[PDB]
Structures are given as structure tokens and as C-alpha cells.
Design an enzyme around this catalytic site. Structure first.
Site, mmCIF file in Angstrom:
data_model
loop_
_atom_site.group_PDB
_atom_site.id
_atom_site.type_symbol
_atom_site.label_atom_id
_atom_site.label_comp_id
_atom_site.label_asym_id
_atom_site.label_seq_id
_atom_site.Cartn_x
_atom_site.Cartn_y
_atom_site.Cartn_z
ATOM 1 N N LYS A 112 -67.847 62.207 54.247
ATOM 2 C CA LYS A 112 -68.557 63.305 54.954
ATOM 3 C C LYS A 112 -69.962 62.840 55.353
ATOM 4 C CE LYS A 112 -65.438 66.719 54.792
ATOM 5 N NZ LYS A 112 -65.071 67.714 55.830
ATOM 6 N N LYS A 194 -55.765 60.520 57.172
ATOM 7 C CA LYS A 194 -55.152 61.824 56.826
ATOM 8 C C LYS A 194 -55.516 62.842 57.909
ATOM 9 C CE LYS A 194 -58.137 64.734 53.884
ATOM 10 N NZ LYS A 194 -58.146 65.896 54.806
ATOM 11 N N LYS A 197 -58.823 68.998 59.219
ATOM 12 C CA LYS A 197 -58.900 70.375 59.774
ATOM 13 C C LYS A 197 -60.118 70.508 60.702
ATOM 14 C CE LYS A 197 -61.046 72.593 55.666
ATOM 15 N NZ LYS A 197 -62.415 72.824 56.195
#
Ligand SMILES: Nc1ncnc2c1ncn2[C@@H]1O[C@H](COP(=O)(O)OC(=O)[C@@H](N)Cc2c[nH]c3ccccc23)[C@@H](O)[C@H]1O
Ligand SMILES: CC(=O)c1ccc(C#N)s1
Lengths: 333, 326
Positions: A112, A194, A197
């Protein structure tokens, strides 16, 4: 009393078939077998900067999506994290039993941070401690999550054991519940990454509320491999794209990998993508029909949040009282 | 009235330096300002310690602030952990605090996350109460600056949610230095406890520590104020002046032709005379469980009423769905 299940999802980005197969599917299936508590983690969501209108809308979107998936407020506790002060209260206390080194080495913090270089904030760093507080407040036995949260879940076990060793049996040591299929659903154009979202490229994702017709086109364009002849076989290292498609089909239909490999013998990626597209389109059409019935019923959503926070508060206040007694605080009158 | 916020650690045993400096200054300004005294038990637990001793020290600190003259009818005095809004706002402010800002604090693998993250909880402690003024020592000026930076940053995004706090500039004027090191200020945190006089010390303890207080080799001995050449005698004069209200020139006149034994004798008597009413009040308040329970309950209720209004505005600004009250 039944063993306790706890899990949460962020009201940010747009929840995907990854979030569903890694977590929400298990949440729905565990509701009779265990005492299930599910949380919309708005305090975690804001570790990535949110627009205020989008955050409020996303919280209510996420609640309606839980209900659409089959989370039943007569069976499960459903609540918004920020409605239960005990989460932040216990989070602070558990900061004092968590090492700086444990937090700095977290993969989510690193990933992040690289993505949001202009907002590497203390919340993003401290993410795992509030998540440990979310779990440990409810005397949680099982935590159904995807593979990506395994590291955070392992820290919550380390914190619980560390605190229990000093003070007694205050917390339950939680165990992960990571599924066999769909624990790590991958991006359609980058199957070594992966499914996100919050992907900058929407063509990577199957969003739970996306137009099924748009999702079918994205499945048809999903990258596969150069194998000659094309063969439908599960092999993450050599056939990441084909494997991801088989994992999604398996997760939707309930058919095993050996069953699907047999079904696709003498067939190529057209048959595979056709079956993935049909199964996913059907799932999303039905899910979305239930979603709009819940999402537009504000009286119902308001009642579910009220009842859920009330049930959650009863459990959380009991655990926090024991934590505060153990660490030596003067009890509030 | 401007709002003043002070955090009181439940660990340090207060000295006459703490009392005759800042505490006495602030006891006599409780009608001038809206003064808040927060006993910071959530800050204390960043240092691993005995649980029963922390509970005891919380009550010890409450009783001593009350004994020093903090009036719970005029000021707000409460235990930090009794007001959930501190932890709630602290998490929110974590998300508007740079990791780099906490890394760059002057004060790593085996430090607990509390010792890393507590400046954010300190910011929440202040910003909850729309605080105008914060009395800070040199050691917490960086922490006040971070609180101001967080307030301005959040306000810039969302509107004037927080007051930007200012340091309380003017200092007490009472000078109290260490008895065996008069160049060093008398500090509650001082490892050498022969350097300090604690507020609960009996007359025999004060005599003993004042008789050991370092002076000088002037011949004849002369009771004259001179910080450079006579740091020890000067400190004893400043302590006596702070207790009695007599000027330094008046005391220099009072001890003409007198030796340091006379000065020391009068310092011990003056100090113990001041600590008598203080200790009588302390032992009365500390052993009245119902009085301390009522002060904590009323203080938490007043704090919560103010804190909840700030947190509601913060939560509304961030965009959280408002809690549904049962
Ligand atoms: N590509 C993928 N394939 C399979 N599963 C996936 C995929 N991407 C995400 N997941 C899983 O979805 C759940 C929600 O993810 P969030 O990012 O909302 O949310 C998270 O990642 C949590 N930190 C939120 C949380 C906060 N407190 C908690 C306490 C217990 C359990 C969970 C939580 C997660 O289970 C996640 O593993
Ligand atoms: C007051 C503050 O800074 C925090 C509250 C909960 C945290 C976690 N985890 S940190």
C-alpha cells in the site's frame, strides 16, 4: 454456546469475486454452524484517503452486498466498525503489546505504501493492531479470510498469546479459516497479481455489482498461455491465467479441479471461458437482483446497523472491561 | 474563557518544584480559563508496568491534584481511559498523520507500537476539547507542533473542525533546582531522589535532604544570591522565597551574619510547613473512595459531553455512517 466467527471487509473500492470466494462465501456458509459476527471496517478503509460521500455510500453498499450474499441478520451480527468505540479503545491498548518490527515487515503496509507514496500514514502502518482488536474483542475462535490476510491473522494470534501469558485467559487465540478454492483469485490481465478491489485497470477485475455483460467480455479477454495444443490444466507456475479461470469456475459451480479437467478434455480455452462466463454471469445477475432490494430499503439497512451494533457492543464491552481490569486501569463508574 | 488542556502522568511522584512552579500557578487561574486535567493512564501503558501499581498511581495522582487545589467544580479532572473518544479520535488522526512525522520524533525493532504512536493519541487528547492553550515543557514542544500540524491539515480538508492549540508561554517564576546539583532543575523523573523533595515527605525526611543540600566554601559563609558563584545557597534562597513570598533582598537582609545551617534550618521548616496542609488534604481525599469515585464520574461526564461533540463533527467530516442509538 457456539464457537465464534469474526470477519470484516472495507467500505472502499468495489468488492470483487476475489473478496467473495476468499471471504464472503465462507461467511454465508458458517452462519448456522458457528456464532457469526461480520463487520464493515470503515476505520480500516480510511487508511487509504477516501472521499467523504463515497465512504458513506460504500459503507451502505457493503452492508447491502453482505445481505445480498445471504448474510442473515436473524442469524449473524452485522455492524459498522466505527459504531463500536471498543475497537479503537482495544486497538490503542494492543499497540503496547505489539512490536514496531512486527508492523514494519507487513506485506500489506509495504504494498500500500508503494502505491500511495504521498499518503504513507500511521493508520496504514498501525492497520494490523486495530485488526487484532477487531478479532480479539469477540472471543473469536475462527476468522474466515483470503490468503492475503494470513500474515495479519498470525500477528493477532501472537498478540493474544503475548497478552494472555502476562494476564491470564483474557482472549481466545483465533484460527484462520482460508478456503481450498478461491483463497487468492488473480487479476484477469495480470494473473501473477491478486485481484484488487481498487484496480486502476477495471479489465483486471470481476466486480460483484458490475454489469454481467461487461464481466463476460472481460472473462473472454483474460490472458491464458501459448501452450500448443491449448490444454485446460491447473498449474499456477506454468498456466497462471487458465488456472485462475478454473479456480473461479470451481468456486462458483462447486465442481473440483479433477472434475473440470476431465470435463475439458479435448477442449481448449473457448469452452473454458464460455463456462466461466456463463457461471459468473448467472451468479452476478441473481446477486445483483437481491442487492437492489436491500440497498434501496434504508429503513431495513438502518435497523440492521442498529441491532448489529447493539449485539456487538454487549460482547465488546465485556472483553474490554476484562482487558482494562488486567492492565491495571481504574474501572469507569 | 479559553480552554486549557494538561495531561497528568499516573506514575511520577510530584516534587516541590512541580507544586510551587506550574501547579500553584494553575490552581490560582481556574476561574480565568476552562482548565482540563486528564490523568493519562492510556499513555502510561506504553511502558510495561505492574497493573495494581498503575491503578494505585492513578488514584494517588487524582488525590494529589485535588490536594494541591484543583477544584472539580471549577476545572474538569478525569481519567483518560474513562472517555472512549480519546482512542476513537486517535485512530482517526493516525490516518491523517505521516508515518515520517512519527519516525522523525526526536525520541526500533523491539520498541512497542504504543511508544511509536503515542504522539497521535496526545494530539487527540488536546484536539477533542477545542483546546486553545497547552502548558508544555521543552520535552513535549515537538508533540504540540505535530498536534498543530494535524489540526491545520484536517481543517484544510474539512473546514474549521479543530481549534489550532497554542503553547501557554508565560512560566511560573518559582525556581527550584536539584539539592545535590543546583545547576540542574529539580525533576520528578530524576533518578537521584536525594536531589528532590516529594510532596508526601515527612519533616524528618526534609531536614535530612536540606542538610545535605550543597552550598559553597565561602569564608566567612555569606547568604547572598549569586547563581554563577553560589548556585547551592541561591537555590535554598529561591526555595525559601517561593514558600514564604519574602523577596531575595529581604532574605539576604534576614540572614546577615548568619551561617548556612541557619538558612537550611529555615528552608526545612518553611517547606514542611507548606507540605502540612497539602499532606493533610491528600490523605483525607486519597482514603475517601466515594469522593474520588464521584470526582472521576462527574469529570468523565463533563469531558465526554465536550469530546462527543468534537468526535461527531470529525466522523461527519470523514463521512462515517452515523451510529444508530438504542
Ligand atoms: N484476490 C482475492 N482473492 C481472495 N480473497 C481476497 C482477495 N482480495 C481480498 N480478499 C479477501 O477479501 C476479504 C475482504 O478484503 P478487504 O480488503 O475488504 O479487507 C481486509 O483485507 C481485512 N484486513 C479487513 C479486516 C479488518 N479487520 C478484520 C478482522 C478479521 C478479518 C478481516 C478484517 C479479506 O478476507 C481478504 O483476504
Ligand atoms: C489513540 C490511537 O492513536 C489509536 C487508537 C487505536 C489504535 C490502534 N490500533 S491507535
Amino acid at each position: 454456546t457456539k464457537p465464534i466467527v469474526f470477519s470484516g471487509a472495507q467500505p472502499s473500492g468495489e468488492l470483487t469475486i476475489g473478496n467473495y470466494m476468499g471471504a464472503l462465501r465462507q461467511w454465508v456458509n458458517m452462519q448456522d454452524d458457528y456464532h457469526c459476527i461480520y463487520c464493515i471496517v470503515d476505520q480500516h478503509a480510511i487508511t487509504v484517503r477516501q472521499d467523504a460521500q463515497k465512504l458513506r455510500k460504500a459503507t451502505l453498499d457493503t452492508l447491502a452486498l453482505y445481505l445480498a450474499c445471504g448474510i442473515d441478520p436473524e442469524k449473524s451480527t452485522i455492524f459498522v466498525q466505527s459504531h463500536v468505540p471498543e475497537h479503537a479503545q482495544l486497538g490503542w491498548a494492543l499497540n503496547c503489546y505489539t512490536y514496531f518490527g512486527e508492523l514494519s515487515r507487513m506485506t500489506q503496509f509495504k504494498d500500500k505504501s508503494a502505491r500511495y507514496a504521498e499518503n504513507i500514514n500511521a493508520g496504514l502502518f498501525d492497520y494490523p493492531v486495530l485488526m487484532a482488536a477487531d478479532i480479539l474483542l469477540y472471543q473469536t475462535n475462527l476468522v474466515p479470510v483470503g490468503e492475503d490476510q494470513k500474515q495479519h491473522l498470525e500477528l493477532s494470534r501472537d498478540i493474544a498469546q503475548r497478552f494472555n501469558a502476562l494476564y491470564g485467559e483474557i482472549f481466545k487465540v483465533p484460527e484462520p479459516f482460508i478456503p481450498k478454492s478461491g483463497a487468492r483469485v488473480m487479476s484477469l490481465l495480470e494473473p501473477t497479481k491478486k485481484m484488487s478491489k481498487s484496480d486502476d485497470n477495471r479489465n483486471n477485475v470481476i466486480g460483484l455489482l458490475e454489469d454481467p455483460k461487461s464481466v463476460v467480455k472481460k472473462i473472454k479477454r483474460a490472458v491464458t498461455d501459448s501452450d500448443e495444443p491449448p490444454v485446460v490444466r491447473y498449474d499456477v507456475q506454468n498456466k497462471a491465467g487458465v488456472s485462475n479461470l478454473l479456480d473461479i469456475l470451481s468456486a462458483v459451480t462447486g465442481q473440483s479441479i479433477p472434475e473440470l479437467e476431465k470435463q475439458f478434455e479435448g477442449k481448449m480455452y473457448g469452452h473454458l471461458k464460455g463456462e466461466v462466463a456463463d457461471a459468473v454471469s448467472g451468479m452476478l445477475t441473481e446477486l445483483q437482483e437481491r442487492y437492489h432490494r436491500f440497498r434501496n430499503d434504508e429503513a431495513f439497512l438502518q435497523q440492521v446497523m442498529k441491532d448489529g451494533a447493539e449485539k456487538a457492543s454487549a460482547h465488546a464491552s465485556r472483553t474490554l472491561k476484562a482487558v482494562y481490569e488486567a492492565i491495571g486501569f481504574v474501572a469507569k463508574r
